[PDB]
């Protein structure tokens, strides 16, 4: 069927306000973090000049051999703060309002957790920095963020005190976490809305999630560029694209839903609180 009254942000807002919209899944990427200062890497180079090919800084095999590049960049690009964005806190609001079924994230910055999404709400599709593991299969010693953070800027390779210690991120050529496949099996059977934010759906198998929803489920993309989705054909019925930055899009949606002050209120204290530390 066709559930949206209009293929626009406004039509999506009206749907979200209705009794029909009970379960929402968010699929998110780099764009939701860029106003928090987290680097994108969708489309960088000069800084890397000191690797056999550029992408190998993000590659599993090279990492095991030559870990220090990656760890050097991690120091270079380490945010001085971790302030979740308007977009992160919009998902927090969905959680508070009993709408958020799951957030599938391509991001490794831990900002969803900081905005108050719980483990059960999240599928960290590309792993996380929140926790790091010894590569030794007979050991697999676990170390926290603060140990990994402290090691990284000391420009020393992190090593296991019992045995290399890797952040739990999925490097190119590495298979995705079990939790991705188990959640995806049931999450999409009964979902009323997909909110796709800050991703161009370029990485697989993350990109395939959008086709998992029922044919009737509306899908809103909030992204800098267009990116199974049919926004513009004579047969378009359920997909809407809002092009621009994620913070501005979520703000416009919040404003349409009557959540603008609420969202603003949430961001202000959460930020000012983080400041105090
Ligand atoms: C896959 S699309 N993304 C998951 C992140 C792991 C692969 C890229 C490594 C990023 C370099 C780390 C920069 C330090 C902030
Ligand atoms: Zn170990």
Curated annotation (Swiss-Prot):
The keyword Cell cycle applies. Binds 1 zinc ion per subunit. Changing residue 107 to A: Abolishes deacetylation of alpha-tubulin. Inhibits deacetylation of histone H3 at 'Lys-18'. Inhibits the block of entry to chromosome condensation and subsequent hyperploidy cell formation in response to mitotic stress. The active site is at 126 (proton acceptor). Changing residue 216 to A: Reduces deacetylase activity. Induction: Up-regulated in response to low levels of glucose and anoxia-reoxygenation stress. Up-regulated by trichostatin A. Down-regulated in response to high levels of glucose. Down-regulated by histone deacetylation in several tumors. Interacts with CDC20, FOXO3 and FZR1. Associates with microtubules in primary cortical mature neurons. Homotrimer. Isoform 1 and isoform 2 interact (via both phosphorylated, unphosphorylated, active or inactive forms) with HDAC6; the interaction is necessary for the complex to interact with alpha-tubulin, suggesting that these proteins belong to a large complex that deacetylates the cytoskeleton. Interacts with FOXO1; the interaction is disrupted upon serum-starvation or oxidative stress, leading to increased level of acetylated FOXO1 and induction of autophagy. This is NAD-dependent protein deacetylase sirtuin-2. It comes from Homo sapiens (Human). The gene is SIRT2.
């Amino acid at each position: 069927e066709r559930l949206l009254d209009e293929l626009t942000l406004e039509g999506v807002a009206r749907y979200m306000q209705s009794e029909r919209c009970r379960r929402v899944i968010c699929l998110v990427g780099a764009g939701i973090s860029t106003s928090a200062g987290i680097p994108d890497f969708r489309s960088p180079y000069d800084n890397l000049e000191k690797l056999p090919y550029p992408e190998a800084i993000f590659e599993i095999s090279y990492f095991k051999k030559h870990p220090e590049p990656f760890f050097a960049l991690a120091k270079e690009l380490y945010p001085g703060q971790f302030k979740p964005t308007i977009c992160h806190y919009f998902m927090r609001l969905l959680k508070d309002k009993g709408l958020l079924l799951r957030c599938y994230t391509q991001n490794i910055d831990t900002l969803e957790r900081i905005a108050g999404l719980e483990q059960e709400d999240l599928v960290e599709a590309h792993g996380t920095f929140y926790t790091s593991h010894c590569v030794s299969a007979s050991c697999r010693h676990e170390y926290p963020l603060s140990w990994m953070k402290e090691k990284i800027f000391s420009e020393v390779t992190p090593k296991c005190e019992d045995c290399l210690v890797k952040p739990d991120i999925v490097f190119f050529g590495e298979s995705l976490p079990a939790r991705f496949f188990s959640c995806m099996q049931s999450d999409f059977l009964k979902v009323d809305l997909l909110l796709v934010m800050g991703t161009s759906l370029q990485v697989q198998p993350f990109a395939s999630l959008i086709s998992k929803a029922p044919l009737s489920t509306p899908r809103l993309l909030i992204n800098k560029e267009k990116a199974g989705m049919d926004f513009d054909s004579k047969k378009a019925y359920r997909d809407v694209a809002w092009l621009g930055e994620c913070d501005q899009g979520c703000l416009a949606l919040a404003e349409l839903l009557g959540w603008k002050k609420e969202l603003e209120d949430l961001v202000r204290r959460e930020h000012a609180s983080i400041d105090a530390q």
